Design a protein around this ligand. Structure first.
Ligand SMILES: C[C@@H](C(=O)Nc1ccc(C#N)cc1)[C@H]1CC[C@@H](c2ccnc3ccccc32)CC1
Length: 375
């Protein structure tokens, strides 16, 4: 069984299980804004509310989950204050009232003060009826940016795929032991179970199409998931008033912050972070934007001896086809993602009178995965 000190749930994997929906009543003022970003934005009174808050303390955030719930709240608020209505009227300074508690709550959690995927996907969800299983119709998110930003779709579908991969994560310890103990039949069985679980994860990703439409994602939701690294409209980054003196640059959320988007490449000995290509560095950098425990899990995989070198050594066609199945499944997940980015960005972007740096990254990530095959 996997170590609980990495905070992987036998059931939900890298998602946070049964996330806190409510902060202690001390924090009712934060909760009210995050619950109503749509309304407060469209009114034009979102910045008014934030600027009129008191500097609350983080010291009443006790349990890990209430701390994770706060970080999701402040991170939604921060993106709303910075980006506004999403049409270019931008704030370059985050008020102490909010920047200070946020930067504190982050340092405690080892995360940066910007909304990351482990916020708005892994900790942003509830099951309506506890007894029923984790299907979309039984699920909701906790927070959103504008009406019809399709944020429910993009986050829950992401999350479901994360859950679909939990099944595969479960097996990783079975692999490394079979190598350590030289149990070949057992290793093959495992690689096949893992491959099946990613074929499953692909069918879940297909659900994307029912719950997101192109116009809304390109023009709206993309705006609120943008950060301030290499961004022209915030050339130097964000001032976190009262916590840091200078403005700091921080990246927008991306699929690259998903552990699952990394853990299997690493398991299979695909050197995504070596060699140093633009894409290679970007995946290494986003590891620092993951929960500390989850960054630790990936790093300790690089520490175990290579699954690729072992399979290559044995001259065993069954192990090769089995290893190939896991690699081919990942190629499917990258190819489907390429299809999604076409439908959801590049086409819309061609209708408004960055966009493509993302495609290169995935053509590279895919080409590096396809070249990691044997037969
Ligand atoms: C929809 C997609 C996403 O971008 N979510 C997402 C949601 C919110 C933010 C933010 N702020 C950023 C990102 C998710 C994550 C990637 C995943 C996937 C694709 C390709 N290759 C894979 C390989 C192994 C496992 C999963 C893979 C598909 C599901």
């Amino acid at each position: 069984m996997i170590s609980k000190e990495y905070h992987i749930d036998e059931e939900v994997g890298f998602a946070l299980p049964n996330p806190q929906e409510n902060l202690p009543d001390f924090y009712n003022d934060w909760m009210f804004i995050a619950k109503h970003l749509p309304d407060l934005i469209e009114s034009g009174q979102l910045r008014e509310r934030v600027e009129k808050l008191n500097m609350l303390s983080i010291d009443h955030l006790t349990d890990h989950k209430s701390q994770r719930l706060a970080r999701l709240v402040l991170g939604c608020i921060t993106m709303a204050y910075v980006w506004g209505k999403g049409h270019g009227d931008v704030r370059k300074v985050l008020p102490r009232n909010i920047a200070v508690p946020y930067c504190q709550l982050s340092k405690k959690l080892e995360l940066p003060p910007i909304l990351v995927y482990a916020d708005c996907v892994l900790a942003n969800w509830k099951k309506k009826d506890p007894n029923k299983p984790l299907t979309y119709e039984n699920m909701d998110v906790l927070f959103s940016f504008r009406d019809g930003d399709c944020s429910k779709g993009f986050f829950l579908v992401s999350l479901l795929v994360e859950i679909a991969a939990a099944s595969a994560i479960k097996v990783i310890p079975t692999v490394f032991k079979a190598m350590q103990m030289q149990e070949r039949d057992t290793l093959l069985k495992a690689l096949l179970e893992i491959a099946s679980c990613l074929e499953k994860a692909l069918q879940v990703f297909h659900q994307i199409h029912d719950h997101v439409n192109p116009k809304a994602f390109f023009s709206v939701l993309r705006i609120y998931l943008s950060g301030w690294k290499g961004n022209p409209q915030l050339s130097d980054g964000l001032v976190y008033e009262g916590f840091w003196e200078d403005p700091k640059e921080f990246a927008g959320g991306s699929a690259g912050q998903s552990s699952v988007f990394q853990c299997f490449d690493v398991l299979l000995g695909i050197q995504q972070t070596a060699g140093g290509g633009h894409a290679a560095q970007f995946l290494q950098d986003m590891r620092r934007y993951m929960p500390p425990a989850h960054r630790n899990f990936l790093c300790s995989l690089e520490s175990n001896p290579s699954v690729r070198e072992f399979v290559l050594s044995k001259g065993d066609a069954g192990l090769r086809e089995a290893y190939d199945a896991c690699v081919k499944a990942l190629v499917s997940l990258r190819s489907y993602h390429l299809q999604i980015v076409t439908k959801y960005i590049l086409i819309p972007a061609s209708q408004q009178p960055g966009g493509t740096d993302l495609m290169n990254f995935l053509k590279t990530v895919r080409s590096t995965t396809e070249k990691s095959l044997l037969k």
